[PDB]
Amino acid sequence: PRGSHMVMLAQQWRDARPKVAGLHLDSGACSRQSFAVIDATTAHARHEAEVGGYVAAEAATPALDAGRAAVASLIGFAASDVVYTSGSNHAIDLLLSSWPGKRTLACLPGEFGPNLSAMAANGFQVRALPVDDDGRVLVDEASHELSAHPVALVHLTALASHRGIAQPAAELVEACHNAGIPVVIDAAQALGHLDCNVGADAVYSSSRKWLAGPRGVGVLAVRPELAERLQPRIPPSDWPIPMSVLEKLELGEHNAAARVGFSVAVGEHLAAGPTAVRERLAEVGRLSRQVLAEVDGWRVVEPVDQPTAITTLESTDGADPASVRSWLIAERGIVTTACELARAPFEMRTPVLRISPHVDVTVDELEQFAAALREAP
Amino acid sequence: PRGSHMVMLAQQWRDARPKVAGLHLDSGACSRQSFAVIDATTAHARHEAEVGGYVAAEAATPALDAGRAAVASLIGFAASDVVYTSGSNHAIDLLLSSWPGKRTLACLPGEFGPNLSAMAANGFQVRALPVDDDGRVLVDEASHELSAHPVALVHLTALASHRGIAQPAAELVEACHNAGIPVVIDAAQALGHLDCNVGADAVYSSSRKWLAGPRGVGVLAVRPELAERLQPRIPPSDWPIPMSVLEKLELGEHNAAARVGFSVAVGEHLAAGPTAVRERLAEVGRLSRQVLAEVDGWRVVEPVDQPTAITTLESTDGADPASVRSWLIAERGIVTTACELARAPFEMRTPVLRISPHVDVTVDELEQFAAALREAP
Ligand SMILES: *[C@H](NC(=C)C(=O)O)c1c(COP(=O)(O)O)cnc(C)c1O
Ligand SMILES: *[C@H](NC(=C)C(=O)O)c1c(COP(=O)(O)O)cnc(C)c1O
């Protein structure tokens, strides 16, 4: 029952942000904005009012591009491959709505419901990939399956919203490449605590989660080979105006402030040491699961040493997590997320309570949670 | 050459916002956020970090609904008919992508390019409506035309981004209703200086303009008869999850902060007196056009007494406004918008410089502009 690695990171992180009113263990849903991030945003809006809205935006180009670059660095793409979105669903929809010719797709059974929804809405046939009892892709079986039965692209949610299994992203991406098939990665969850530098052809993620930037921002990155094959829904493909596929994908009103906010927030991840941060988040999972290994009416779902901060609890006596969550919030200020089946229809047989705490979490807090979980009605 | 009505409104408005670095005459592109609005936004983001992101959002429901209601009041819809968007293009796309059965449409020749683009992208046949030499719809001819040749809906940009003609919105809407045809109104420009209470079946607008709220927010309002006929692209119409058409349209990650920001900003319009504000904006146009009636190399396009703050200048010696604009900004701190043909392809034969100043503008400033316009190379 091993103890915690003391890191000045956990502490710097905590103090860089407003103090939690209660106890916040859902950076997986929406993390917490640093003062700098918050202020960077406010600043932009202030500046919009001074110099003019679109001149302010121009002025922010350095900062916007900063963020692209930072994002690019974490996924191994070019900054010029990275576009801004409203989030990871805007992202996957921009992508799939743009996707040329044949629209077959393989993905995990664990695939995110709203993703499947976008997949379906864009007319993709969607096969499952072989997995283990956890939902972790069997990379071998999948390679064989993908050669035998080819598919127009593979969509890998590298880290799932509903379960803290880290998918073997890089080895699936090579397997898929060996079969001559592109890989889209949903890194909404993964960007910030999984090595997202893995060879993917497109990646997307959201600002508000592990990168702890503003809501209303996400990113989509597409390798230029793929980017230029894409056919944006809007404008129509018979286009008088000459702009690139990515320029088309990034077209539309948006909170630029939030985007500069985001840029700060990514910068801050890089600043803290990507690799340093992921190791802590992995530890956070360990501690979280070791601390929660002993709770009646609640089973920990993920293997102890999954390198992840998402841990999920299945109720062993029919308790509904949705309720437990809103209890935990209203009574004890503890913020959690409650994952309904719709999050992963073809894998979740039963809902779960999701702890997703950041580096800042202490063993006290994990213990406060465990405690408060027991006292829960 | 009549003078200005002194109103404590102009002054209250100015002082409620950060002071303009130079001179800002493009509230038509992006206006200026009050301190309250800016702070309301920051606050939300701060609060996200304290209590949790989605609990903060819940908490803001009062404020969010406030804004719907306020918007609703200005267009004569129910607050429950109003949904939040990213802007007026998200809006028209959400609408047209959702539109059932036959997709014919009539609109002005003056129709906004990006609108036509969305129209086309959603497979609408798009007829023009009869207009005068200004582009103002001939309501009579149009009624006759719409009875003789029916169309699945009419799309009226009530106030055009490229020209400060106020379209006879209410009388066209009855004409269209007398022919049994619904009206969608693009009130991106109009919401805030035209009476948008006119009988339209859907209306949409943006936060960042005359309502001077945050970027990344717009609104879409749809009357329930129409709302429930609509078929959202995403999720697919074969939907396991039971949510209303509007709930579907409002689904997706977003800057909630910005939305509460917006709510403040609408509130502030109501607070100032809608009718009071529009009368000033109309005066602003008068003054703007009277002050600019005498400039060489620049003709005022709109009739003097169009009840509008948008005035546009056509260069009489081949000057490119794009350039003049970026000169005006870099040299004299005067912010303007330069309207390229793409803004209204089937009406604009030639680009224009657009003054769109708010209530705060003084005759000095309009004169400073006129002056600075002369000295421009
Ligand atoms: C993020 N989502 C959540 C609210 C959560 O609690 O998990 C998410 C997204 C959705 O992207 P948006 O930015 O549009 O919200 C994408 N896919 C995954 C795996 C996920 O974690
Ligand atoms: C607003 N647009 C401008 C940038 C301008 O300078 O006019 C606009 C919109 C576009 O909506 P978004 O909120 O997506 O930008 C819609 N239609 C009109 C008439 C217009 O003024």
C-alpha span between B192 and A108 (Å, rounded)? 48
DSSP A56: H
- Tokens standing for B164? 């400060």
Q: Does A138 touch chain B (CB under 8 A)?
A: no
- Measure A119 CA to ligand 2 centroid, in angstroms: 30
The architecture of the domain spanning B8-32+274-374 is Alpha-Beta Complex (3.90)
Residue from the list A41, A48, A335 with its beta carbon closest to the beta carbon of B52: A335
**Which stretches of A169-293 are DSSP H helices?**
169-178, 224-227, 245-249, 256-272, 274-292
Provide the 3-class DSSP secondary structure of residue A219: strand
Q: For residue B310, which ligand has an atom nearest its CA?
A: 2
Mutual angle of helices A321-332 and A363-374, in 10-degree steps = 110
C-alpha closest to that of A36 among A212, A205, A189, A190: A212
Beta-bridged to residue B218, according to DSSP, are B85, B206
- Measure A314 CA to ligand 1 centroid, in angstroms: 20
Instruction: Determine whether the interchain pair A42/B46 forms a contact, defined as Cβ–Cβ distance below 8 Å.
Output: no
Cβ contact B220:B202 at 8 Å: yes
C-alpha span between B172 and B199 (Å, rounded)? 10
Cβ contact A356:A29 at 8 Å: yes
C-alpha closest to that of A179 among A135, A143, A218, A139: A143
Please report, for residues A69, A288, A373, the alpha-carbon distance to residue A294 in angstroms, rounded to integers and kept in the order given: 43, 11, 11
**Which residues have C-beta within 8 Å of that of residue A61, sequence separation ≥ 6?**
none
The C-alpha of B120 sits at a distance from chain A's nearest C-alpha, in angstroms, of: 7
Cα A183 to the center of its chain, rounded Å: 16
- Tokens standing for A306? 């999954």
- List B residues 321-350 in contact with A (Cβ-Cβ < 8 A): 329, 333, 335, 337, 342, 345
CA-based radius of gyration for chain B:
21
C-alpha span between B301 and B280 (Å, rounded)? 20
C-alpha span between A311 and A288 (Å, rounded)? 7
Q: For residue A86, which ligand has an atom nearest its CA?
A: 1
Please tell me the CATH code under which domain A8-32+273-374 is placed.
Answer: 3.90.1150.10
Cβ contact B83:B250 at 8 Å: yes
**Which residues have C-beta within 8 Å of that of residue B84, sequence separation ≥ 6?**
B64, B68, B217, B218, B219, B220, B250, B254, B259, B262
- B36-272 and B8-32+274-374 share a CATH fold: no
- Tokens standing for B377? 């190379």
> What would the 3-class secondary structure string for chain B be?
CCCCCCCHHHHHHHHCCCCCCCEECEHHHHCCCCHHHHHHHHHHHHHHHHHCHHHHHHHCHHHHHHHHHHHHHHHCCCHHHEEEECCHHHHHHHHHHCCCCCCEEEECCCCCHHHHHHHHHCCCEEEECCECCCCCECHHHHHHHHHHCCCCCEEEECECCCCCCECCHHHHHHHHHHCCCCEEEECCCCECCECCCCCCCEEEEECCCCCCCCCCCEEEEECHHHHCCCCCCCCCCCCCCCCCHHHHHCCCCCCHHHHHHHHHHHHHHHHHCHHHHHHHHHHHHHHHHHHHCCCCCCEECCCCCCCCCCEEEECCCCCCHHHHHHHHHHHHCEECEEECHHHCCCCCCCCEEEEECCCCCCHHHHHHHHHHHHCCC
- Measure B88 CA to ligand 2 centroid, in angstroms: 6
What residues in B contact A86, CB-CB < 8 Å? 86, 252-254
C-alpha closest to that of A302 among A266, A268, A339: A339
What residues in B contact A255, CB-CB < 8 Å? 214-217, 255, 258
Q: Is the peptide bond before B321 cis (omega within 30 degrees of 0)?
A: no
C-alpha span between B265 and B262 (Å, rounded)? 5
The chain A residue lying nearest B330, using CA atoms, is A55
Q: Is residue A180 left, alpha or beta, with left meaning phi > 0 and alpha meaning psi from -120 to 50?
A: left
C-alpha span between B367 and B277 (Å, rounded)? 22
C-alpha closest to that of B126 among B135, B136, B116: B116
Cβ contact B27:B209 at 8 Å: yes
C-alpha closest to that of A212 among A4, A9, A27, A11: A27
With residue A370 as reference, give the H or E element that holds it.
helix A363-374
**Which residues have C-beta within 8 Å of that of residue A80, sequence separation ≥ 6?**
A68, A246
Beta strands B334-335 and B352-355 are: unpaired
DSSP A76: T
C-alpha span between A315 and A298 (Å, rounded)? 5
The residue extents of the domains of chain A are 8-32+273-374, 36-272
SS3 percent helix, strand, coil of chain A, rounded to 5, is 45, 15, 40
- Measure A333 CA to ligand 1 centroid, in angstroms: 23
Cβ contact B348:B162 at 8 Å: yes
What residues in A contact B55, CB-CB < 8 Å? 329, 335
Provide the 3-class DSSP secondary structure of residue A340: coil
Please report, for residues A234, B38, B170, the alpha-carbon distance to residue B137 in angstroms, rounded to integers and kept in the order given: 28, 38, 12
**Which residues have C-beta within 8 Å of that of residue A370, sequence separation ≥ 6?**
A291, A292, A294, A295
**Which residues have C-beta within 8 Å of that of residue B80, sequence separation ≥ 6?**
B68, B246
Q: How was this structure determined?
A: X-ray
- Tokens standing for A41? 């945003």
Instruction: Determine whether the interchain pair B45/A214 forms a contact, defined as Cβ–Cβ distance below 8 Å.
Output: yes
Instruction: Determine whether the interchain pair A216/B214 forms a contact, defined as Cβ–Cβ distance below 8 Å.
Output: no
Q: Look up tokens 């990006």; give the residue.
A: B114
C-alpha span between B134 and A111 (Å, rounded)? 54
Beta strands B334-335 and B154-157 are: unpaired
What residues in A contact B214, CB-CB < 8 Å? 45, 255, 257
CA-based radius of gyration for chain A:
21
Beta-bridged to residue A291, according to DSSP, are none
C-alpha span between B282 and B269 (Å, rounded)? 15
- Tokens standing for B352? 């224009």
Cβ contact B68:B80 at 8 Å: yes
Mutual angle of helices B256-272 and A256-272, in 10-degree steps = 150
C-alpha span between B278 and A110 (Å, rounded)? 54
**Which residues have C-beta within 8 Å of that of residue A33, sequence separation ≥ 6?**
A17, A18, A41, A212, A213, A214, A261, A265, B45, B46, B48, B49
Instruction: Determine whether the interchain pair B234/A93 forms a contact, defined as Cβ–Cβ distance below 8 Å.
Output: yes
Q: Resolution, rounded to a tenth of an Å?
A: 3.0
- The domain defined by A36-272 folds into Aspartate Aminotransferase; domain 2 (3.40.640)
